Amino acid sequence: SQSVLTQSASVSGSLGQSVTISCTGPNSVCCSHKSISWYQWPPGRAPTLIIYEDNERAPGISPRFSGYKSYWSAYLTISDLRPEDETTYYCCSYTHNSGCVFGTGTKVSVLG
Amino acid sequence: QGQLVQSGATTTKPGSSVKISCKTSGYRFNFYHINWIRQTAGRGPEWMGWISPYSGDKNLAPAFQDRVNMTTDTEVPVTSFTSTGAAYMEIRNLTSDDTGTYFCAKGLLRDGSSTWLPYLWGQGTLLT
Amino acid sequence: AVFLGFLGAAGSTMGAASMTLTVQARNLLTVWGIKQLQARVLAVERYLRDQQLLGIWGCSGKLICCTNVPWNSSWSNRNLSEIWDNMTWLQWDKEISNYTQIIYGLLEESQNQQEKNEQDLLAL
Amino acid sequence: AVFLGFLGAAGSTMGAASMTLTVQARNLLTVWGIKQLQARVLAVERYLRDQQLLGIWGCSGKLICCTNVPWNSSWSNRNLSEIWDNMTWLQWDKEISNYTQIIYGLLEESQNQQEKNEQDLLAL
Amino acid sequence: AVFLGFLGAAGSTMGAASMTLTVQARNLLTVWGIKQLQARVLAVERYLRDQQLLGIWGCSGKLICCTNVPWNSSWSNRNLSEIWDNMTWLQWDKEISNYTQIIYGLLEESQNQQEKNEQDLLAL
Ligand SMILES: *[C@@H]1O[C@H](CO)[C@@H](O[C@@H]2O[C@H](CO)[C@@H](O[C@@H]3O[C@H](CO[C@H]4O[C@H](CO)[C@@H](O)[C@H](O[C@H]5O[C@H](CO)[C@@H](O)[C@H](O)[C@@H]5O)[C@@H]4O)[C@@H](O)[C@H](O[C@H]4O[C@H](CO)[C@@H](O)[C@H](O)[C@@H]4O)[C@@H]3O)[C@H](O)[C@H]2NC(C)=O)[C@H](O)[C@H]1NC(C)=O
Ligand SMILES: *[C@@H]1O[C@H](CO)[C@@H](O)[C@H](O)[C@H]1NC(C)=O
Ligand SMILES: *[C@@H]1O[C@H](CO)[C@@H](O)[C@H](O)[C@H]1NC(C)=O
Ligand SMILES: *[C@@H]1O[C@H](CO)[C@@H](O)[C@H](O)[C@H]1NC(C)=O
Ligand SMILES: *[C@@H]1O[C@H](CO)[C@@H](O)[C@H](O)[C@H]1NC(C)=O
Ligand SMILES: *[C@@H]1O[C@H](CO)[C@@H](O)[C@H](O)[C@H]1NC(C)=O
Ligand SMILES: *[C@@H]1O[C@H](CO)[C@@H](O)[C@H](O)[C@H]1NC(C)=O
């Protein structure tokens, strides 16, 4: 591992509640001069774009997922935890002519 | 809004090279970039690079610039807004560190600030 | 800008094609003369229909014209970015073909219920 | 409202008919083809005359259009309530038939003596 | 004023002729019927061209219409007084005949780069 964009290690939640995943790094990949994307990523399978450009959801994404980016860190909130949410979430910083600088990852458990 | 089927799970040995296919359908293949992403057993996800099936333009991370052979065909138009394209992926100096699952990713939009963003992904291919 | 010409941005994004409108606005207007005079009359007829529609909408004189009719999600539940920076106008015309008559009536009375509101405004 | 249709309020009060204007605004625009092509051309000619008149009046684009020409009592010394809530537009056209050309000229220069006043306004 | 009539101020100064515009704006719109129906169609065609040009300029509805395109001295380095109080419109048409197409394009995008500026204004 060598991801200069760290996340929130891991976190837990319960059904009906809301979580929050952090994503920050140095001034070289974050934040007010970069767009943050969020990917739900089951273990080594088919990922899914959730939010692009800090707080813009992908087509058909549930209104539960929300994004916020302060001047030093970006957050992904998962309002109203539904059972099909146990997976790993990765963030990525980018501009209009760059690549995805992915994050470390954050496993989110919904056991309740 | 279409599929991006890939090749099988081919496992060779270090020093060699591997070719991975990415066959598209259900969308105008020229209208969106083709990103290449991998998740290896040793790190996490790592963005490799994208290529424009329209501009023929390549942009790839410096960690994979001198290893990756990245090409595309030309779309066989099905309808006014459907076609069938193909993107190809090869690597040079191969090791056991590069063992992981690989997928192609069609871009998100055709303009703006998130034009190339890996939106529509493939299925995954297991390397060495 | 690049002078793409007539229908130059036909395969471009709707946001790119919307910048080049006056190009398609310019190029919009013996027994065989009877067939030529026929096409000459139909040309002004199909052109005045678009102007009559634009006239009873308050858009008379506009290439880009804003209104008060809010966008019903039943017509298209697509986001703004996935329309102007993704689809082409040829694609958008197929997705809204059905509801294209519903909107034309909403524009007609949103204009009559605007000049009626302006008539009461200037009545004092 | 009740969709009375084309000329629906022809026998209604002028105030009631004035609410349903875009309905009459929509429906306003081989040897026998020569007689059909004739009616097709006259249709755009009689329509553009109303638009040319509306254009040189400042009403270009309006179904209801207010002006500066004040109402001369010589045209009709009737009260406002005994017009919009009593007579029909067919009745009003007979009472103003004579003076209908006098007003069309008053509107023409009240517009030229308005865009001339606006030209001096934007000259500084 | 003196009702000079149609083309009355054709030999007058451009400032004098500019006051009498609605006069020239009014009077602007079997085998021999084929030659008469031909002239009838061409009449609306040559008239709608001036209106289509005026429409994509923002002047739709104006006899006198001001713009944002500044006067290039290459077109005519004449002073304002030696134009409106000296030359006739027939003289001015010969001096600007060449550059008359250059200005028609400057008006076209000065309008598209105005309704585009107004679209961003009403976006908040
Ligand atoms: C036909 O259809 C195709 C496919 O849909 C259209 O191609 C797409 O156009 C859009 C916008 O026109 C492109 O998005 C832009 O992407 C650039 C990234 O380019 C930069 O980086 C590249 C790699 O580093 C590089 O190629 C570029 O350098 C130049 O040189 C190449 C040489 O091949 C040349 O081909 C390029 O055109 C460049 O000129 C460049 O350095 C990105 O920079 C853009 O963002 C800017 O602009 C947007 C507004 O557009 C703005 O919001 C941003 O903030 C930023 O200012 C923009 O995202 C897309 O990559 C193209 N390709 C796809 C989608 O596959 C094509 O335009 C259509 N043409 C017509 C006529 O319809
Ligand atoms: C959308 O249109 C439907 C009819 O197709 C109508 O019943 C509904 O009220 C509309 N909704 C909005 C928010 O305008
Ligand atoms: C328009 O109506 C037809 C009716 O058969 C339907 O099949 C089609 O899906 C409709 N279009 C849209 C965009 O819903
Ligand atoms: C009314 O019209 C007559 C001509 O018919 C005119 O002489 C008179 O001045 C007008 N009065 C008003 C108040 O406009
Ligand atoms: C119009 O003029 C005629 C001329 O004979 C006259 O009889 C008629 O009364 C006039 N109309 C009105 C409304 O005065
Ligand atoms: C005048 O027009 C010429 C082209 O004929 C152009 O090069 C020049 O920039 C223009 N000058 C001004 C001040 O608009
Ligand atoms: C217009 O162009 C012709 C080209 O021969 C030139 O002779 C004439 O002087 C030009 N007109 C003006 C007003 O410069």
Tab-separated table of C-alpha atoms in Angstrom, chain A residues 1-2 35 37 39 41-49 51-53 58-59 90 92-104, chain B residues 33 35 37-39 42-48 50 59 101 103 108-109 111-124 126:
chain	number	residue	atom	x	y	z
A	1	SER	CA	0.000	0.000	0.000
A	2	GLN	CA	1.071	3.583	-0.694
A	35	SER	CA	-13.017	16.763	-7.429
A	37	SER	CA	-15.489	10.674	-6.384
A	39	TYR	CA	-16.978	4.147	-5.394
A	41	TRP	CA	-16.486	-1.644	-4.296
A	42	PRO	CA	-17.395	-5.219	-3.352
A	43	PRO	CA	-14.297	-7.408	-2.871
A	44	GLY	CA	-12.548	-7.499	-6.240
A	45	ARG	CA	-15.780	-7.479	-8.245
A	46	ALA	CA	-17.965	-4.961	-10.086
A	47	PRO	CA	-17.653	-1.478	-8.515
A	48	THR	CA	-20.235	1.315	-8.718
A	49	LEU	CA	-19.908	5.079	-9.036
A	51	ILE	CA	-20.871	10.425	-6.252
A	52	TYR	CA	-18.714	12.549	-8.556
A	53	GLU	CA	-17.594	16.176	-8.203
A	58	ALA	CA	-24.367	9.191	-10.409
A	59	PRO	CA	-27.543	8.335	-12.370
A	90	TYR	CA	-12.950	4.053	-1.977
A	92	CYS	CA	-10.650	9.329	-5.669
A	93	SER	CA	-9.333	12.831	-6.352
A	94	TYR	CA	-9.128	14.139	-9.905
A	95	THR	CA	-9.359	17.149	-12.183
A	96	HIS	CA	-10.630	17.485	-15.755
A	97	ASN	CA	-7.434	16.133	-17.378
A	98	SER	CA	-5.982	13.817	-14.730
A	99	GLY	CA	-6.488	10.340	-13.279
A	100	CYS	CA	-8.187	8.812	-10.257
A	101	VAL	CA	-5.981	9.070	-7.156
A	102	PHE	CA	-7.767	6.361	-5.193
A	103	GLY	CA	-8.001	6.066	-1.421
A	104	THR	CA	-7.124	3.425	1.140
B	33	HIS	CA	-12.917	7.200	-22.770
B	35	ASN	CA	-10.100	3.615	-18.290
B	37	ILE	CA	-8.177	-0.096	-13.262
B	38	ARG	CA	-6.762	-2.951	-11.189
B	39	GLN	CA	-6.995	-4.146	-7.580
B	42	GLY	CA	-0.613	-6.088	-1.946
B	43	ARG	CA	-2.182	-2.667	-2.397
B	44	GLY	CA	-5.723	-1.545	-3.137
B	45	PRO	CA	-7.146	-0.057	-6.318
B	46	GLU	CA	-4.772	1.694	-8.699
B	47	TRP	CA	-5.749	3.809	-11.697
B	48	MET	CA	-3.619	2.822	-14.689
B	50	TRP	CA	-7.460	5.944	-20.012
B	59	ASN	CA	-3.095	9.449	-20.623
B	101	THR	CA	-8.167	-8.385	-10.972
B	103	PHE	CA	-11.298	-4.294	-15.570
B	108	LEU	CA	-18.778	9.128	-17.444
B	109	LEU	CA	-19.622	12.070	-19.729
B	111	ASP	CA	-17.864	17.109	-21.726
B	112	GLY	CA	-17.244	19.006	-18.508
B	113	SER	CA	-14.891	18.353	-15.592
B	114	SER	CA	-15.737	14.646	-15.073
B	115	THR	CA	-15.577	13.530	-18.695
B	116	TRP	CA	-13.256	10.516	-18.351
B	117	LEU	CA	-14.315	9.365	-14.872
B	118	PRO	CA	-14.473	5.527	-14.766
B	119	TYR	CA	-18.253	5.056	-14.696
B	120	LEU	CA	-19.275	1.849	-16.507
B	121	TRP	CA	-16.986	-1.033	-15.536
B	122	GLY	CA	-16.335	-4.450	-17.031
B	123	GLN	CA	-16.430	-7.799	-15.228
B	124	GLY	CA	-12.880	-8.531	-14.044
B	126	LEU	CA	-7.718	-12.705	-12.882
